[PDB]
Amino acid sequence: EEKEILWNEAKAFIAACYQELGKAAEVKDRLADIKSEIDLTGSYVHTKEELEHGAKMAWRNSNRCIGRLFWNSLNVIDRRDVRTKEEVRDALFHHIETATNNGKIRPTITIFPPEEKGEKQVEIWNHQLIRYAGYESDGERIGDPASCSLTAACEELGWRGERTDFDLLPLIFRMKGDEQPVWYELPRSLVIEVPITHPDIEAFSDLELKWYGVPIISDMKLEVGGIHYNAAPFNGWYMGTEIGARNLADEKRYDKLKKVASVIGIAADYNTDLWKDQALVELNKAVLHSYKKQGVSIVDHHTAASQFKRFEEQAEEAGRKLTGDWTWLIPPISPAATHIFHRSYDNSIVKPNYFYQDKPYE
Amino acid sequence: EEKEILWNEAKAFIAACYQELGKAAEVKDRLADIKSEIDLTGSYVHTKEELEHGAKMAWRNSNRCIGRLFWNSLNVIDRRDVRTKEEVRDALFHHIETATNNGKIRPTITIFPPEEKGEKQVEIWNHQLIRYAGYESDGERIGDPASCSLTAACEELGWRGERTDFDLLPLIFRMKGDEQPVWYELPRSLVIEVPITHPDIEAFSDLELKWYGVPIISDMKLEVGGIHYNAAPFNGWYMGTEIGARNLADEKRYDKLKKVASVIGIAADYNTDLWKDQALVELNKAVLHSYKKQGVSIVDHHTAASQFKRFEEQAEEAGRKLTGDWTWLIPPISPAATHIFHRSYDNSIVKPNYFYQDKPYE
Numbered sequence A, B: 001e002e003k004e005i006l007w008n009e010a011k012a013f014i015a016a017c018y019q020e021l022g023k024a025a026e027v028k029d030r031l032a033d034i035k036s037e038i039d040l041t042g043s044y045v046h047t048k049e050e051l052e053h054g055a056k057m058a059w060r061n062s063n064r065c066i067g068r069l070f071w072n073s074l075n076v077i078d079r080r081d082v083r084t085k086e087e088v089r090d091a092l093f094h095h096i097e098t099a100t101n102n103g104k105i106r107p108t109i110t111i112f113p114p115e116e117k118g119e120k121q122v123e124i125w126n127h128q129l130i131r132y133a134g135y136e137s138d139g140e141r142i143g144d145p146a147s148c149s150l151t152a153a154c155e156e157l158g159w160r161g162e163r164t165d166f167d168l169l170p171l172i173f174r175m176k177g178d179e180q181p182v183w184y185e186l187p188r189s190l191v192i193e194v195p196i197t198h199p200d201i202e203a204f205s206d207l208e209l210k211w212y213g214v215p216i217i218s219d220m221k222l223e224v225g226g227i228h229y230n231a232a233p234f235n236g237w238y239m240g241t242e243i244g245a246r247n248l249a250d251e252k253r254y255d256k257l258k259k260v261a262s263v264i265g266i267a268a269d270y271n272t273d274l275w276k277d278q279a280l281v282e283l284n285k286a287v288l289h290s291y292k293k294q295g296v297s298i299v300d301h302h303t304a305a306s307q308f309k310r311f312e313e314q315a316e317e318a319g320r321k322l323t324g325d326w327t328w329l330i331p332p333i334s335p336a337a338t339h340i341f342h343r344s345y346d347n348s349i350v351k352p353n354y355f356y357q358d359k360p361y362e
């Protein structure tokens, strides 16, 4: 069955990929080559062109992503050649550096060797390459609660966090054949962070908030033509709401709205005062202001939705069906001020795509 | 087929309704009576208890409604006895008066005679009993654009609006056997309106905004045990966002955000300033403040979501499956500040319920 799944996915992908690349006549010969290779080896190897366009298609097909207008400019780094943990580590450090690009963030994916028999070659434990640790003991909460389980797993492996609210987690990944993952501390010179200040409210700096510049999702599987690249970290730039309306605002994350209300000088006593809503707006203004002031790329949800409208128009004009997840595409503040809120989207799954996979901790 | 649909729906409803009312032993005899009556007459007549509990179940099952905690306190007015347009008119005036209740709004439904052979007895044209007219001609836009088609239909029937931004539409409905609907101007003494002012920003009154106190949906069909009550207007009180984030804010409604930005003293030039979001928050604070100041019932979206959480808990504790439409339940501002955003809901349709029906104009 598994070979048949591979071949079917391969045929669909090569046909579509080569159509898009004007390579349509080459399909027949390529598929034969692939067919032989699957027969003989149990798998097949993507050309560099296939891998690159595959990763770009996968982004284009990510229903939950509002940033898809820019799918065709994804910077694809082919690291199928890595064999050692030092090579993996250095490839991850390199991804951080080149994606960060001194603040002018470059959307990038680094692709490691794919699963073989469903056997991973490299297993990345981080949710994002750069993320803050979380701790909870004896009613005492420090840092990012969403990182508690991974932080605990790291501290099993000999790492120790400083227990600041913003400890950078080490990179943590396991190689095929190894029983335990290894971990490496992130060089601070590689990691851009932005202090949060407000354009008009000087007191806002009293909250001592900061966030990291580049969100690099490192625990999803890229699937292309039936090949499973479980290790393939990718990044864009942030939409400000991800930081201001969720990471710093959710009760189960940094939970800062009451403190924000206090520094902006409003009471946090009555639901009818909409103090949470006002605090959310000021916090979100502060996030955008701060990233802009430091020269780190970011987009606001209005501009992002306008770009997404262009993606919709481009899809139509190219004759491609659009898919989307309305529940993720709407921004978490003022969603009815965007066109997204007022239309519907077909949530069908099209491949290539990025998929969730089980965590090796938990 | 139609008789069989009726009987099947009847059996399901009577069984469930009588279980809820502790009337379980009476089911067998009631169903026999109904069975005979369907056989002989092609239909059956609800007892007052059935009609009342049916309307309450229908509210309880309205997936899109965040206000459902209070389903059991619905005030049900049985007007199956009306036969004339004066009786219908007076029943609608009465609903306005008793639902309004001097500002302490009482959730109410008035139920008119049901469809017979799919033949309506009374056909209400209004979307809500109280709503503002809309006009568009020669690039000139006045009032509520959502009311343009109904306003035009009314002006075909000899009515003429003053072309203020807030003209009250007349009640408009058609009786079985009549070719045209009739219309009646709303007595202004019956209609409470609220001027919009802001708690701290005196200039806000310069916008001369107002809205009406009571939203009375008058174009949906109540279906109970296979009986189709196409004319059955109902009301709750407003959630403030319906007015501040949608009616007064949508570009295709009153479209007031740019004017709001100006009176609150912020620039409306840059997406990154989040001026739309800030304007939305102040407008929404103003709506709640103004309704409260005038002694007209209203709920904010935080309190509403807290009440809805209690509805969820009550459903579970009573052993009833909960259904909901996440896309309608989330409020249009700060939705991620409510628990609703962070869980999912089964959008299955359960009857009794309220349904859309085709408009007789358009």
Ligand code: HEM
Residues within 6 Å of the ligand: A055, A059, A062, A064, A065, A066, A067, A068, A070, A074, A107, A108, A109, A234, A235, A236, A237, A238, A239, A242, A299, A304, A328, A354
């Ligand atoms: C270029 C700037 C980008 C922006 C502004 C952007 C924006 C977003 C946002 C706001 C989300 C919602 C996620 C959340 O609420 O946590 C998202 C989800 C997602 N984005 Fe993008 N994105 C960008 C680039 C990318 C790239 C380069 C890829 C892959 C190559 C990608 C793939 C995805 C995927 C797979 C999800 C869903 C993740 C999940 O289900 O957890 N995005 N995007």
Ligand code: HEM
Residues within 6 Å of the ligand: B055, B059, B062, B064, B065, B066, B067, B068, B070, B074, B107, B108, B109, B234, B235, B236, B237, B238, B239, B242, B299, B304, B328, B354
């Ligand atoms: C008591 C106060 C009530 C509140 C605060 C409330 C709140 C809401 C809100 C905010 C909506 C969203 C509608 C929109 O965006 O236009 C809604 C929808 C709805 N509500 Fe309620 N509601 C209440 C009472 C009622 C009552 C008494 C009924 C019926 C007996 C009802 C039935 C519905 C229905 C059927 C919808 C969906 C309408 C549609 O699909 O267009 N609600 N409710």
Ligand SMILES: CNCCN(C)c1cc(C#N)cc(CCc2cc(C)cc(N)n2)c1
Residues within 6 Å of the ligand: A215, A216, A217, A234, A235, A236, A237, A238, A239, A242, A247, A356
């Ligand atoms: C099981 N994984 C959960 C996925 N979720 C909920 C998820 C959580 C967080 C956080 N914090 C962040 C994301 C990433 C969203 C994203 C990805 C990229 C490439 C760019 C961007 N601006 N945002 C996804």
Ligand SMILES: CNCCN(C)c1cc(C#N)cc(CCc2cc(C)cc(N)n2)c1
Residues within 6 Å of the ligand: B215, B216, B217, B234, B235, B236, B237, B238, B239, B242, B247, B356
């Ligand atoms: C085809 N009908 C469209 C239904 N829609 C979109 C719809 C539009 C408007 C407006 N303006 C208002 C509603 C009513 C929502 C409602 C109903 C009740 C009983 C109480 C309440 N607070 N809100 C529904």
Ligand SMILES: C[C@H](O)[C@H](O)[C@H]1CNc2nc(N)[nH]c(=O)c2N1
Residues within 6 Å of the ligand: A341, A342, A343, A344, B327, B328, B329, B330
């Ligand atoms: C297309 C989309 O489902 C549509 O905009 C819905 C979304 N959620 C909503 N929610 C409410 N309460 N009211 C609405 O009119 C809408 N519009």
Ligand SMILES: C[C@H](O)[C@H](O)[C@H]1CNc2nc(N)[nH]c(=O)c2N1
Residues within 6 Å of the ligand: A327, A328, A329, A330, B341, B342, B343, B344
């Ligand atoms: C249960 C619900 O689907 C869940 O809260 C989703 C809703 N929409 C979202 N949208 C984005 N962009 N990110 C999220 O984490 C979520 N959470």
Ligand SMILES: [Cl-]
Residues within 6 Å of the ligand: A215, A242, A247
């Ligand atoms: Cl994030």
Ligand SMILES: [Cl-]
Residues within 6 Å of the ligand: B215, B242, B247
């Ligand atoms: Cl309304």
